[PDB]
Design a protein around this ligand. Structure first.
Ligand SMILES: Nc1ncnc2c1ncn2[C@@H]1O[C@H](COP(=O)(O)OP(=O)(O)O)[C@@H](O)[C@H]1O
Ligand SMILES: CCN(CC)C(=O)c1c(NC(=O)c2cccs2)sc2c1C[C@H](C)CC2
Ligand SMILES: [Mg+2]
Length: 331
């Protein structure tokens, strides 16, 4: 057994909000694992709504804080031969993509491997090599990026095929939580010095999918997957063979047509209510990620929220959803 761990990350105010002397309606207390939301009142007299999570990260949280506290422990587990998934869930504009992918610091100040704005995916890839290269491990790394837009499936990493070619999926008859995606490419990442270019290619494929599909970056779900095959020779000369898997899933924005997002919510409702039928089959996303939801994968949710009063209602909606999720048992 193990419950799904759910963490909240509040994003900071941006330029416009900061010059507009915006006041945060959100207070985060990481030590009591608590986010408090100002639901009407004033900064003078106020009703507040409070929520407890597995972790909360306030507006001051940096990319390094998330990597150290959330990602390292999960990566260690994938290195031990486990499957793990991290979802980012939240309204458009609250930092899902920032969290999972990150941005470049302006004016070329950093290399990619040192950029403070690097998110979970590049930091993860960089550390896999940095951990396994030096200790005595023979290992391979494959990555894939399967994205879902309007219940069709796209491979965003494959450098020799166009983005507009949809893929097909079927059930795996060997394993039962399982599906085969015909024609999804697993790209072998030979060393840390091939990481950037692989991701750059996918970036370029993203730009075009965006031209072709309306509000692609908001309405699409992406699943970036890393697989590590490892033959470890222990200092005692014993040879340990293991398979680690990590899914990094950047969900469609949750703001109030998206069958996968609808079904995700229904799948979570079913799992926390222990309704005996769980509607996995009702969308591509919940079929692909069936094992992440009441399955054998260690699963974490980062719910991204905003400090601004404008987003009160959607912030509340994110936190209620995220808060339900805590009750789901995986193994
Ligand atoms: N923790 C953060 N620190 C700095 N900027 C952030 C943070 N979270 C989100 N942002 C900023 O907010 C804007 C939108 O974030 P983005 O990753 O596109 O959100 P989403 O993917 O949820 O729609 C971007 O300008 C991004 O740089
Ligand atoms: C900054 C442009 N890049 C990196 C090429 C990204 O947008 C990006 C990622 N970010 C990054 O790799 C970085 C940010 C800052 C330092 S490294 S991770 C990722 C992509 C795109 C790809 C489709 C899937 C996974
Ligand atoms: Mg985004």
């Amino acid at each position: 057994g193990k419950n799904i761990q759910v963490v909240v990350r509040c994003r900071p105010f941006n330029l416009a909000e900061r010059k507009a002397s915006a006041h945060s309606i959100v207070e985060c207390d990481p030590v009591r694992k608590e986010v408090s939301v100002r639901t009407g009142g004033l900064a003078d007299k106020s009703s507040r709504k409070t929520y407890t999570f597995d972790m909360v990260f306030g507006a001051s949280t940096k990319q390094i804080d998330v990597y150290r506290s959330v990602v390292c422990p999960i990566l260690d587990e994938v290195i031990m031969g486990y499957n793990c998934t991290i979802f980012a869930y939240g309204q458009t504009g609250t930092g899902k993509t920032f969290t999972m992918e990150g941005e470049r610091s302006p004016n070329e100040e950093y290399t990619w491997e040192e950029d403070p704005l690097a998110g979970i995916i590049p930091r993860t890839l960089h550390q896999i090599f940095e951990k396994l290269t030096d200790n005595g491990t023979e290992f391979s790394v494959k990555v894939s990026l399967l994205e879902i837009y309007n219940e069709e499936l796209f491979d965003l990493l494959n450098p020799s095929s166009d983005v507009s070619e949809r893929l097909q999926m079927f059930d795996d008859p060997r394993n039962k939580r399982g599906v085969i995606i015909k024609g999804l490419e697993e790209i072998t990442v030979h060393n840390k010095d091939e990481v950037y270019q692989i991701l750059e290619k996918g970036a370029a494929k993203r730009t075009t999918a965006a031209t072709l599909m309306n509000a692609y970056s908001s309405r699409s779900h992406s699943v970036f997957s890393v697989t590590i095959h490892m033959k470890e020779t222990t200092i005692d000369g014993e040879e340990l063979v293991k398979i680690g898997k990590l899914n990094l899933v950047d969900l469609a924005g949750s703001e109030n047509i998206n069958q996968s997002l609808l079904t995700l919510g229904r799948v979570i409702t079913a799992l926390v209510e222990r309704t005996p039928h769980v509607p996995y089959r009702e969308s591509k996303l919940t079929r692909i990620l069936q094992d992440s939801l009441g399955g054998r994968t260690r699963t974490s949710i980062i719910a991204t929220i905003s400090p601004a009063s404008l987003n009160l209602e959607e912030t509340l909606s994110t936190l209620e959803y995220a808060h339900r999720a805590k009750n789901i048992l995986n193994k």
